[PDB]
Amino acid sequence: SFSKEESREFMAIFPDIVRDLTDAGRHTDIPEVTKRFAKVLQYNVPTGKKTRGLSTVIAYKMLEKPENLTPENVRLAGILGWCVELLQASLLIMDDLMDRSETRRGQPCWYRQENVGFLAINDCLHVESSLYSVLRKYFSHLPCYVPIIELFHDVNFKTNMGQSLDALCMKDGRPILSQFTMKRYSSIVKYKTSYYTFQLPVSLGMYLADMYDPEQHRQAKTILMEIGEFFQIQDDFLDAFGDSQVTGKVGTDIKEGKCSWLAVVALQRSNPAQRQIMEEHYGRPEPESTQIIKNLYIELGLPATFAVYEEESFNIIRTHIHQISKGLPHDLFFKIMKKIYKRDA
Amino acid sequence: SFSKEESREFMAIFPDIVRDLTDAGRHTDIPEVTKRFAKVLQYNVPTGKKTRGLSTVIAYKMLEKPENLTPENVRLAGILGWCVELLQASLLIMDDLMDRSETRRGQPCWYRQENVGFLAINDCLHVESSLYSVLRKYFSHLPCYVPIIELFHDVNFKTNMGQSLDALCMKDGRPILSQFTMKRYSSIVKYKTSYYTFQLPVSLGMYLADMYDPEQHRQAKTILMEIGEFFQIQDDFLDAFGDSQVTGKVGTDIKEGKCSWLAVVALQRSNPAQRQIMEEHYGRPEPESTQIIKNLYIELGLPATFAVYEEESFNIIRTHIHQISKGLPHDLFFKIMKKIYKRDA
Ligand SMILES: O=P(O)(O)C(O)(Cn1ccnc1)P(=O)(O)O
Numbered sequence: 137s138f139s140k141e142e143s144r145e146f147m148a149i150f151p152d153i154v155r156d157l158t159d160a161g162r163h164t165d166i167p168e169v170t171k172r173f174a175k176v177l178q179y180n181v182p183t184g185k186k187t188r189g190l191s192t193v194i195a196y197k198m199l200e201k202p203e204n205l206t207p208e209n210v211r212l213a214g215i216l217g218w219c220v221e222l223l224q225a226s227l228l229i230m231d232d233l234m235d236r237s238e239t240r241r242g243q244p245c246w247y248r249q250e251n252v253g254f255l256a257i258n259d260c261l262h263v264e265s266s267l268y269s270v271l272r273k274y275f276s277h278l279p280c281y282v283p284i285i286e287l288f289h290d291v292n293f294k295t296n297m298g299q300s301l302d303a304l305c306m307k308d309g310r311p312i313l314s315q316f317t318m319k320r321y322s323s324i325v326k327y328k329t330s331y332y333t334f335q336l337p338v339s340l341g342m343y344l345a346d347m348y349d350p351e352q353h354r355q356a357k358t359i360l361m362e363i364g365e366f367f368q369i370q371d372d373f374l375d376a377f378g379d380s381q382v383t384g385k386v387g388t389d390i391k392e393g394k395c396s397w398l399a400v401v402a403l404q405r406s407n408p409a410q411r412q413i414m415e416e417h418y419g420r421p422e423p424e425s426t427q428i429i430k431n432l433y434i435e436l437g438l439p440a441t442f443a444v445y446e447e448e449s450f451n452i453i454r455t456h457i458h459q460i461s462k463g464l465p466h467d468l469f470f471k472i473m474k475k476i477y478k479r480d481a
Numbered sequence: 482s483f484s485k486e487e488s489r490e491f492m493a494i495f496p497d498i499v500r501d502l503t504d505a506g507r508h509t510d511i512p513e514v515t516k517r518f519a520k521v522l523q524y525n526v527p528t529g530k531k532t533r534g535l536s537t538v539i540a541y542k543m544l545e546k547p548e549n550l551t552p553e554n555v556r557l558a559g560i561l562g563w564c565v566e567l568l569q570a571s572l573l574i575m576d577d578l579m580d581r582s583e584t585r586r587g588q589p590c591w592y593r594q595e596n597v598g599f600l601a602i603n604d605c606l607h608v609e610s611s612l613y614s615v616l617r618k619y620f621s622h623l624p625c626y627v628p629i630i631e632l633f634h635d636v637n638f639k640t641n642m643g644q645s646l647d648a649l650c651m652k653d654g655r656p657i658l659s660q661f662t663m664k665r666y667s668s669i670v671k672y673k674t675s676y677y678t679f680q681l682p683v684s685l686g687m688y689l690a691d692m693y694d695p696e697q698h699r700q701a702k703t704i705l706m707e708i709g710e711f712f713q714i715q716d717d718f719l720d721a722f723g724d725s726q727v728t729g730k731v732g733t734d735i736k737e738g739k740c741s742w743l744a745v746v747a748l749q750r751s752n753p754a755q756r757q758i759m760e761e762h763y764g765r766p767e768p769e770s771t772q773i774i775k776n777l778y779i780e781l782g783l784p785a786t787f788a789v790y791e792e793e794s795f796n797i798i799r800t801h802i803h804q805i806s807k808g809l810p811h812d813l814f815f816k817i818m819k820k821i822y823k824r825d826a
């Protein structure tokens with residue numbers, strides 16, 4: 137689980153994904169575009185932490201019968217993991233344009249790079265569509281094919297709903313702070329993050345292991361939605377308080393007026409003077425307004441508030457994993473939480 | 482074909498599609514975004530001429546055995562046509578962002594609406610993903626289900642390749658005029674327009690009629706790519722010479738430095754002085770420069786050249802239809818060509 141050997145095995149597949157999409161004897165009349173797409177893939181797909189792709193393989197190895205774990209079936213789980221990584225890559229290209237971000241994975245965001253700009257918009261769609269080409273190549277003769285493509289379809293649609301709810305934080309250049317509740321927060325993160333980051337890898341592992349029981353899927357979902365909310369709260373903490381040299385990205389949530397966990401908790405914790413600071417300075421383009429909000433988050437003790445929350449929530453989620461039944465391996469969920477707890481990136 | 486009653490039948494399906502995507506008892510925890518998505522669909526999907534969707538129905542009606550053309554199967558063909566219209570709607574949202582366009586279908590481009598902006602990228606992805614939900618609801622039981630899903634994903638990938646070749650007209654803010662050949666042009670149009678506009682409707686009609694022979698799809702493709710080249714050449718002519726109140730869109734190709742048909746033929750026809758006018762003024766945002774290029778296009782006689790092309794190409798394509806397999810209905814291709822060329826004879 138999240139070992140050097142598992143990482144080597146997963147990265148070994150990446151060159152074959154690139155070949156499948158750009159050098160498989162198709163589209164031989166437009167090599168300018170196919171060579172450029174190979175670069176799109178090289179830059180935007182493989183330089184993250186790869187937790188979703190690696191989790192797809194770990195889920196499969198922990199769900200499948202040991203006697204069925206052939207080189208070929210483990211490679212298929214890795215290919216499914218790369219299809220989740222293509223989905224992630226696509227989402228981040230669009231997200232960085234929508235959030236006016238500077239850096240991603242330690243480099244300038246794709247849309248900012250020389251002679252990219254608005255080309256990043258098509259590249260996002262192209263990366264998304266490419267995962268279905270990979271699924272068709274490897275899975276089209278297997279019983280899991282239709283469930284897998286339908287799951288990717290459904291998760292895409294849900295992720296788009298979450299990305300829209302996330303974007304509705306601002307109207308006419310001011311944040312809708314009266315609506316920044318923990319209820320709204322939980323709904324945003326369920327849709328924009330939890331389905332594609334946590335539900336999708338585990339459901340893919342289940343499908344490849346010929347596990348289709350709707351009740352087993354629903355019990356995995358309940359715990360993976362809790363893990364997803366936890367994970368997004370960590371992401372929100374890193375936006376304001378992370379070291380951008382370690383996280384690889386400069387935060388934008390304050391300037392973009394987002395209904396982040398920090399904003400929700402700041403509103404819960406603020407006295408009336410602090411609430412007026414949020415009303416005046418949250419979601420503004422001016423660097424001085426964002427620093428006023430960061431200084432409010434410091435004064436409120438939001439770093440220590442997050443640290444306590446993270447520890448308390450880690451323990452609650454593990455209590456809930458202990459209560460899982462429907463024949464699901466508790467250690468799969470424990471390994472996912474161990475990997476993310478106390479992360480700084 | 483392309484009659485008022487056929488339009489009535491087709492249009493009646495749209496409200497059912499909107500209900501399927503926004504008011505079918507799903508995602509009941511996020512009514513803010515489902516209600517917004519209904520508005521996205523209303524603005525962006527049924528506001529065109531519906532040639533592609535209507536053509537899907539006509540293709541099915543001409544390819545299926547007459548004895549099998551039940552109201553129910555004709556309605557299925559209509560649903561597939563609306564899936565093509567969801568793909569069109571998505572592509573135009575993103576295209577208008579990429580092309581920095583003002584109007585589409587006689588209203589502001591979606592991204593220009595208040596509280597839209599780069600959220601239009603997310604709306605584009607959401608509208609395309611929608612069509613796969615529609616396919617699952619209505620077609621999941623039929624032999625054609627997987628081929629239809631795969632055709633949509635393949636056509637999306639190809640269209641993305643075409644959109645990227647189209648975008649690579651400019652480098653470092655100046656057009657790559659030496660590369661603006663008719664060979665490059667024909668490649669751009671094949672990928673960015675012809676597959677999704679002409680091949681997709683016909684191949685969908687074929688699949689719904691249980692026609693899986695790749696040779697029948699390929700015979701159709703030869704004709705449909707020729708019609709697609711005229712359709713995109715007409716679009717390019719009207720970008721400079723159309724009336725925006727009639728076309729519903731303000732042209733941008735000169736300012737954007739595009740490898741349009743006008744640019745390609747201008748470079749073929751230009752004397753050295755005229756080529757220097759293209760070098761200095763093509764692909765510039767300054768309105769003087771764009772008017773100087775339009776004046777060059779007039780001086781070169783490009784309007785008459787286009788009118789000759791519209792007449793000659795109709796007659797060349799008609800001759801080519803005569804040579805198609807006796808196994809395909811020649812009149813389907815004649816009907817498509819007559820509608821695109823606005824001719825009864
Ligand atoms: O905070 P976001 O939701 O924008 C983010 O987490 C990306 N994202 C998009 C949807 N779910 C997550 P990132 O901080 O990586 O920019």
Ligand SMILES: O=P(O)(O)C(O)(Cn1ccnc1)P(=O)(O)O
Pocket residue numbers: 572576577580647673674716720730
């Ligand atoms: O000229 P474009 O290719 O941008 C266009 O035809 C749209 N489009 C996009 C792909 N194929 C066609 P429109 O003139 O409608 O803006």
Ligand SMILES: C=C(C)CCOP(=O)(O)OP(=O)(O)O
Pocket residue numbers: 183184185186187224241329333367368371481
């Ligand atoms: C859902 C979220 C928080 C987006 C970023 O995901 P990661 O932090 O896993 O980013 P990468 O490893 O893929 O770069």
Ligand SMILES: C=C(C)CCOP(=O)(O)OP(=O)(O)O
Pocket residue numbers: 528529530531532569586674678712713716
């Ligand atoms: C491929 C092209 C030329 C894009 C516009 O297509 P239409 O002119 O068919 O657009 P709508 O009817 O859908 O508005």
Ligand SMILES: [Mn+2]
Pocket residue numbers: 231232235237
């Ligand atoms: Mn972001």
Ligand SMILES: [Mn+2]
Pocket residue numbers: 231234235302
């Ligand atoms: Mn975001």
Ligand SMILES: [Mn+2]
Pocket residue numbers: 371372375
């Ligand atoms: Mn974030």
Ligand SMILES: [Mn+2]
Pocket residue numbers: 576577580582
């Ligand atoms: Mn355009």
Ligand SMILES: [Mn+2]
Pocket residue numbers: 576579580647
């Ligand atoms: Mn365009």
Ligand SMILES: [Mn+2]
Pocket residue numbers: 716717720
């Ligand atoms: Mn055009």
